[PDB]
Structure 1
Amino acid sequence: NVMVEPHRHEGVFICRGKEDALVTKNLVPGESVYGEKRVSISKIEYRAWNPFRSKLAAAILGGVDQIHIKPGAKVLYLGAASGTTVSHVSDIVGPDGLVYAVEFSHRSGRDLINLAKKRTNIIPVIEDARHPHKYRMLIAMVDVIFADVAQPDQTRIVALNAHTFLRNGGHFVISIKANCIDSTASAEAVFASEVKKMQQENMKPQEQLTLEPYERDHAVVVGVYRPPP
């Protein structure tokens, strides 16, 4: 009874019917990662992507032009946490792609390894994102960097990681929480300051979108790193 519509982002679908859900094709059929419900069409199974819990899902539903996470792409994911959003990213990139999930917390790390056991295209890295040199052996050159660390010098952390592992012309997607950067300043003032700091390194922000319906005081910035001449 379900009808499925293609989404503008490759690898992403939208599911209607009894459920109003944004979905991705399940890489491991018959398995649920964190209790999300699944639907089948005929042969093909999809997993619901919760926008209330995830921030990338909120950005996609918010009307973002580009996410740059595509099938067969290498993604470096900073701030993996338990891996709820990581599992959907692993679905999009498919068997050809690789996801590097970096998480410093030990309790969230234990959930990643269980998820990484069932998915071959996820590479768990239990390290600190402030020191990209401490895990350079594990990560090759990547295409997209996603950062959701929610920590005051997020811009410097991304730039250090982008210089070491992000190819020329690669893209970055950064989630910014206004009250984490500065609790007392206004949200739009905080967001503009981060835009200035990105320009200081060789990062060109191309768009900015706020996550009003599912979160508050959050913004997502998509840009390119070392753009070709």
Structure 2
Amino acid sequence: VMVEPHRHEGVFICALVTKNLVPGESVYGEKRVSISEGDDKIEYRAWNPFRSKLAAAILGGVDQIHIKPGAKVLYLGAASGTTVSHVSDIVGPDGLVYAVEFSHRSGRDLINLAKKRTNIIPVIEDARHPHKYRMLIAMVDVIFADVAQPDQTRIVALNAHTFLRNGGHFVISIKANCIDSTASAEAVFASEVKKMQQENMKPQEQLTLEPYERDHAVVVGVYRPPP
């Protein structure tokens, strides 16, 4: 058995891989591995931690990612869809990934990616203005955010208050010098964690991403809003 289920459902090893929702096709040139046994066949896609902060976090030993089969995911800052494609593999056909990205150039890549993946909804919009797209987004189980803005906690909190179920979870990427380049990484991460707590986004774990990225954190937690 050459590829084993990782601890996280929907992830596998052998080197992280996910199960390819679109057998035969690569998204960004990644290695694909197909295994056949009699009539049976299954393909996996390599998941590069130098291109995907979520992969870096999984190889770094994150306890929970909450992105799992059947999950509904709001992905803020989807860029051209590199990580989104693996999220799509993980949540599978009964899951959903809204890919919010404000660049029209990257949006074109996301639209091309979603032609083959029925579980991706490209939302080509500024995540600071969720009122512009709130009629497209059903309540989600998880928010993944990589918007890399000084005000990203406020941005993520606003989307959470609008779209994230009570008891749902969040996975937030924090690049310290995109939030405040004159502060130390520790000061940025502490300040962001503090701000998250004040929005009822309760961190349950936080880790950095060395050796894949410098001064880059991932914070995972649970959203527990008031009545």
Q: TM-score range by the shorter chain?
A: over 0.9
Q: Aligned pair 1:36/2:30, yes or no?
A: yes
Give the distance between the partners of 2:125 and 2:181, measured in 1 at CA.
27
TM-score w.r.t. the length of structure 2 is 0.96
TM-aligned CA distance change 1:227 to 1:131, over 3 Å: closer
Counterpart mapping for 1:157-196 below 5 A: 157-196=155-194
Q: Is the 8 A contact 1:72 1:96 kept in 2?
A: yes
TM-score, length of structure 1 as denominator length? 0.95
The 8 Å contact of residues 67 and 173 in structure 1, kept in 2 or not, is answered as yes
Q: Residues 105, 123 of structure 1: CA spacing in aligned structure 2 closer, same or farther, 3 A cutoff?
A: same
Q: How far does the alpha carbon of each residue in 1:78-109 deviate from its partner, in whole angstroms, 9 at most, with x for none?
A: 00000011110000000000000000011101
State how far apart, in whole Å, the 1-side matches of 2:188 and 2:97 are. 30
1:126 and 1:70 mapped to 2: Cα distance?
Answer: 24
Instruction: Say which SS state the counterpart of residue 137 (structure 1) adopts.
Output: helix
Question: CA-to-partner distance for each residue in 1:104-130, whole Å, 9 max, x for gaps?
Answer: 011101101110111111001011100
Q: Is the 8 A contact 1:169 1:228 kept in 2?
A: no
Alpha carbons of 1:228 and 1:157: their partners in 2 closer, same or farther (altered >3 Å)?
closer
Percent identity between the aligned chains? 100
Kindly indicate whether the alpha-carbon contact (under 8 Å) linking 1:97 and 1:121 is maintained by their aligned counterparts in 2. yes
Partners of 1:76 and 1:203 in 2: CA distance: 15
Deviation of residue 212 (structure 1)?
A: 1.0
Question: Quick one: distance in 1 between partners of 2:28 and 2:89?
Answer: 14
SS of the aligned residue for 1:168 comes to strand
> SS of the residue aligned with 2:135?
coil
Q: Distance in 2 between matches of 1:201 and 1:88?
A: 29
* Structure 2 unaligned regions, length at least 5: none
Unaligned runs of 5+ in 1: 16-20
The root-mean-square deviation of aligned C-alpha atoms, in Å, is 1.3
Deviation at 1:206, TM superposition (A): 0.9
Deviation at 1:157, TM superposition (A): 0.3
- Following superposition, the deviation at residue 227 of structure 1 comes to 6.4
Residue 183 of structure 1: how far off its partner (Å): 1.0
The worse-fitting range, judged by mean Cα deviation, of 43-52 and 175-184 is 175-184
2-structure distance, mates of 1:55, 1:221: 11
Count of residues in Structure 1 that have an aligned counterpart in Structure 2? 223
Q: CA deviation at 1:5?
A: 2.0
Q: Is the 8 A contact 1:52 1:214 kept in 2?
A: yes
Segments of 4+ in structure 1 off by > 6 A?
Answer: none
What's the secondary structure of 1:34's corresponding residue?
Answer: coil
Larger displacement relative to structure 2 (35-44 or 107-116): 35-44
